[PDB]
Write a protein that binds this ligand. Structure first.
Ligand SMILES: OC[C@H]1O[C@H](O[C@H]2[C@H](O)[C@@H](O)[C@@H](O[C@H]3[C@H](O)[C@@H](O)[C@H](O[C@H]4[C@H](O)[C@@H](O)[C@@H](O[C@H]5[C@H](O)[C@@H](O)[C@@H](O[C@H]6[C@H](O)[C@@H](O)[C@@H](O[C@H]7[C@H](O)[C@@H](O)[C@H](O)O[C@@H]7CO)O[C@@H]6CO)O[C@@H]5CO)O[C@@H]4CO)O[C@@H]3CO)O[C@@H]2CO)[C@H](O)[C@@H](O)[C@@H]1O
Ligand SMILES: OC[C@H]1O[C@H](O[C@H]2[C@H](O)[C@@H](O)[C@@H](O[C@H]3[C@H](O)[C@@H](O)[C@@H](O[C@H]4[C@H](O)[C@@H](O)[C@H](O[C@H]5[C@H](O)[C@@H](O)[C@H](O)O[C@@H]5CO)O[C@@H]4CO)O[C@@H]3CO)O[C@@H]2CO)[C@H](O)[C@@H](O)[C@@H]1O
Ligand SMILES: OC[C@H]1O[C@H](O[C@H]2[C@H](O)[C@@H](O)[C@@H](O[C@H]3[C@H](O)[C@@H](O)[C@@H](O[C@H]4[C@H](O)[C@@H](O)[C@H](O[C@H]5[C@H](O)[C@@H](O)[C@H](O)O[C@@H]5CO)O[C@@H]4CO)O[C@@H]3CO)O[C@@H]2CO)[C@H](O)[C@@H](O)[C@@H]1O
Ligand SMILES: [Ca+2]
Ligand SMILES: [Ca+2]
Ligand SMILES: [Ca+2]
Length: 404
């Protein structure tokens, strides 16, 4: 059994009294709903309030979300209910606290009294010219324009970041990683950090553009998009690695699918069209996150159909990740918990077998492990396609589930 939960949104840092402190009162509800792993925000000092512009990596006390003691308490509480904690790891780039003689911010401070992570421009990818001194290796991946990109090919950088990661586990209690902007460095480099730290899982955020047609809708065939994600997993070690990826292919397709185009939910081979259909054990599915939804709203799930998104990911193969707001602020808490219970009691996992029964514009009906049937769509009657022996168990707006 495995269900992730994003425990923060874009506005979390503003929480009165601290976000971690507030989360202490949500631990029990989250654990009772069947969640096994909670993804927490970048924990270090950051030039930006949300944490995505890390500076002094060891300075947990300077975070806007809360300090080391508060974080350690929240992780301790989570563990007490058998729930793991995933840390958001932002290592593609990093901000330097001080300026050098050139007047450029490229002299770093790790947050401790000794020299750990107290880097200089020699650790900045030489091709990031706005900040480098031209002496480092070239960037192994994409560049982040708003800050110095780190040279992961540097021996000292690799050694110190691994040491830092191991510390997040031993000192704070973290169990796994969420690799932020993973396309910023090569999978070969991600492999160094993953294999060197033994996380329970390392879910990478590889967000690439989804090919569309003349009408602006994503093309039905998204094989190139999911191939890019599967290629990343193969390069980090495949089945022998703790690495996996967020299923953005399923996210982009489902966004379009629920608008009366449910025929998009099956490929020509009869499989799910996202990463879920090719390598389910390595696919972390989701309806929205702090970027796509929340207050950034870069690619929001159709608001009136959010529960169809959950009826889909919670009953299907792949590893589902519930978004904070949807669980607590949308009036869906009971419905979401009911779906997770169905997944759990029926022994459904990331590798459960999927057999799609109907995939028409206004009706998608599928059977999982021969134990659960799920339907989403505006068409009311799908009675004729429900196998003998099944009876409704959970239902709501344009969705229903049957069990044997
Ligand atoms: O006074 C307050 C302040 O004081 C002190 O801060 C000082 C710093 O310590 C010094 O280093 C120095 O700061 C410099 C920085 O080192 C340097 O990096 C900075 O860069 C600018 C940048 O040029 C600007 O463009 C801007 O950044 C924007 C950016 O352009 C936007 O695109 C955006 O980026 C956001 C995304 O919008 C958002 O989606 C999110 O993306 C993440 C996703 O959410 C996640 O899922 C995914 O995995 O990863 C992506 C990221 O890869 O987050 C992005 C980043 O936040 O917003 C940013 C703004 O946040 O501003 C940058 C900083 O200003 O230039 C300065 C030069 O001055 O000086 C500082 C002041 O003297 C103190 O240390 C600090 O704690 C305190 O807060
Ligand atoms: O079934 C026994 C099988 O065992 C071994 O295979 C395992 C493999 O070692 C392990 O890595 C893992 O395989 C991954 C694979 O590495 C990864 O690339 C992906 O595979 C995707 C392809 O990426 C995707 O392109 C593919 O679509 C192909 C289609 O398969 C082809 O027939 C056609 O020509 O092209 C299309 C694309 O246009 O779909 C694949 C998924 O089915 O994910 C798999 C895991 O799902 O796991 C393997 C199975 O355990 C041996 O290596 C193999 O020889 C044995 O047959
Ligand atoms: O098992 C025998 C049973 O069969 C028939 O009922 C079943 C039905 O045929 C089958 O398709 C399935 O129905 C699902 C439905 O597909 C699913 O979307 C959801 O339905 C929601 C609606 O989305 C929502 O709009 C709805 O509000 C309706 C309200 O239900 C109507 O009474 C009213 O007229 O209109 C409003 C607004 O349009 O509420 C539904 C409930 O969540 O869930 C249903 C299941 O409840 O399952 C049916 C039951 O197995 C026969 O009709 C029935 O008599 C037999 O007992
Ligand atoms: Ca130092
Ligand atoms: Ca950069
Ligand atoms: Ca980079």
């Amino acid at each position: 059994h495995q269900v992730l939960f994003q425990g923060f949104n874009w506005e979390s840092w503003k929480q009165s009294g601290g976000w971690y402190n507030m989360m202490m009162g949500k631990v029990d509800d989250i654990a009772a709903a069947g969640v096994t792993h909670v993804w927490l925000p970048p924990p270090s000092h950051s030039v930006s309030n949300e944490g995505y512009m890390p500076g002094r990596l060891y300075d947990i006390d300077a975070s806007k979300y809360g300090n080391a003691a508060e974080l350690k308490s929240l992780i301790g509480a989570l563990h007490g209910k058998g729930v793991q904690a995933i840390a958001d790891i932002v290592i593609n780039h990093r901000c330097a606290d001080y300026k050098d003689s050139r007047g450029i911010y490229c002299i770093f401070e790790g947050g401790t009294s000794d020299g750990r992570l107290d880097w200089g421009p020699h650790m900045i990818c030489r091709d990031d010219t706005k900040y480098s001194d031209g002496t480092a290796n070239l960037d192994t991946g994409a560049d982040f324009a708003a800050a110095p990109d780190i040279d992961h090919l540097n021996d000292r950088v690799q050694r110190e970041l691994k040491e830092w990661l191991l510390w997040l586990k031993s000192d704070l209690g973290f169990d796994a990683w969420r690799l932020a902007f993973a396309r910023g460095y090569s999978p070969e480099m991600a492999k160094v950090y993953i294999d060197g730290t033994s996380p329970s899982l390392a879910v990478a955020e590889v967000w690439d553009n989804m090919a569309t047609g003349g009408d602006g809708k994503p093309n039905y065939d998204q094989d190139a998009h999911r191939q890019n994600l599967v290629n990343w997993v193969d390069k980090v070690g495949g089945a022998a690695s703790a690495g996996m990826v967020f299923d953005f292919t399923t996210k982009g397709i489902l966004n379009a699918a629920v608008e009366g185009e449910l025929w998009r939910l099956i490929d020509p081979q009869g499989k799910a069209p996202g990463v879920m259909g090719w390598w389910p054990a390595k696919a972390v599915t989701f309806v929205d996150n702090h970027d796509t939804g929340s207050t950034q709203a870069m690619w929001p799930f159709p608001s009136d159909k959010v529960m169809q998104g959950y009826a889909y990911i919670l009953t299907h193969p792949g590893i589902p990740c519930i978004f904070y707001d949807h669980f607590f602020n949308w009036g869906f808490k009971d419905q979401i918990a009911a779906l997770v219970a169905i997944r759990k009691r029926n022994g459904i996992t990331a590798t459960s077998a999927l057999k799609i029964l109907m995939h028409e514009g206004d009706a998608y009906v599928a059977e999982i492990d021969g134990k659960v049937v799920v339907k989403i769509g505006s068409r009311y009657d799908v009675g004729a396609v429900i196998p003998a022996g099944f009876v409704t168990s959970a239902h709501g707006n344009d969705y229903a589930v049957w069990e044997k």
